[PDB]
Amino acid sequence: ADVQQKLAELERQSGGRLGVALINTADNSQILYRADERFAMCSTSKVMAAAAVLKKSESEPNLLNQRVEIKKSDLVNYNPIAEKHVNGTMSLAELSAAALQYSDNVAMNKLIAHVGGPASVTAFARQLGDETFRLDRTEPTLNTAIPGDPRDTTSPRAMAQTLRNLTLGKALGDSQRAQLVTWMKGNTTGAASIQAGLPASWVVGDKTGSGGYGTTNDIAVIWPKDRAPLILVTYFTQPQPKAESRRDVLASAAKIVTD
Numbered sequence: 001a002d003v004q005q006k007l008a009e010l011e012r013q014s015g016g017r018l019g020v021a022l023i024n025t026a027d028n029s030q031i032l033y034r035a036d037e038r039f040a041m042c043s044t045s046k047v048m049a050a051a052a053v054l055k056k057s058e059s060e061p062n063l064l065n066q067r068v069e070i071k072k073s074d075l076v077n078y079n080p081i082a083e084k085h086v087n088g089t090m091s092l093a094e095l096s097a098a099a100l101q102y103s104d105n106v107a108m109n110k111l112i113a114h115v116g117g118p119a120s121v122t123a124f125a126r127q128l129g130d131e132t133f134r135l136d137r138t139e140p141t142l143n144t145a146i147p148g149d150p151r152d153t154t155s156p157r158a159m160a161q162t163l164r165n166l167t168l169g170k171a172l173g174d175s176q177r178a179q180l181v182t183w184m185k186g187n188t189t190g191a192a193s194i195q196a197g198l199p200a201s202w203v204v205g206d207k208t209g210s211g212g213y214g215t216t217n218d219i220a221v222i223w224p225k226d227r228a229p230l231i232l233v234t235y236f237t238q239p240q241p242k243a244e245s246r247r248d249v250l251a252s253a254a255k256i257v258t259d
């Protein structure tokens with residue numbers, strides 16, 4: 001396709017490795033580029049962890065109100081919300097919102113720990129029929145994004161399908177799905193990534209990620225006014241361990257696949 005040559009060229013010019021999966025719910029069509037290759041999810045794995053907690057809350061009434069202690073020793077590389085609550089408690093709802101909307105790594109660690117650890121988040125993905133997702137480590141090591149390392153990776157195809165199932169499909173109960181959508185729509189970190197490649201007025205819920213090797217990711221549900229939504233995963237990674245992030249590549253991919 002023309003979109004394929006455009007994604008191929010975007011990738012070639014970038015010098016990196018681009019993974020794209022788009023689902024257009026209007027006709028159930030997909031646009032796939034390296035869609036079965038594994039990419040380090042980085043902070044995009046936060047959606048699966050928050051969704052695991054949402055699922056757990058369907059059978060455990062008042063779960064989101066459960067308090068979690070924040071210690072200074074819990075602080076990692078990035079935790080703008082949790083650092084404000086050192087020696088205080090945050091509810092699982094507050095942790096989910098911090099993880100999803102501010103990409104708070106301590107929040108993600110508390111979500112991971114709540115469900116039983118990285119393997120438990122992976123078990124949750126398996127329960128939804130996602131056989132690709134794997135969460136192996138906690139924050140911050142889950143972001144190393146070493147080329148060829150399968151830890152903490154998924155494929156664009158798998159993540160797009162899962163994200164569709166979570167936000168639009170029946171993977172979660174009605175209220176939990178609406179909650180995840182609300183959390184993602186309220187993301188504050190996504191303006192330079194997928195969103196930057198879309199018409200300014202479109203409603204977007206997304207989760208960005210960054211990591212080693214200039215890994216730059218974004219997973220999104222896009223609701224254009226008067227249209228059916230799109231699910232889009234754009235994963236990008238580079239040859240150099242200390243490569244700077246390339247959110248512009250995700251924005252360019254978003255534009256290519258949405259035009």
Ligand SMILES: *C(=O)N1C[C@H](NOS(=O)(=O)O)CC[C@H]1C(N)=O
Pocket residue numbers: 041042043044077078102103105140143189207208209210211212
């Ligand atoms: C997630 O990938 N991380 C936590 C935080 N995310 O912010 S981002 O989604 O805007 O990139 C900072 C980067 C990253 C990490 N290495 O912890």
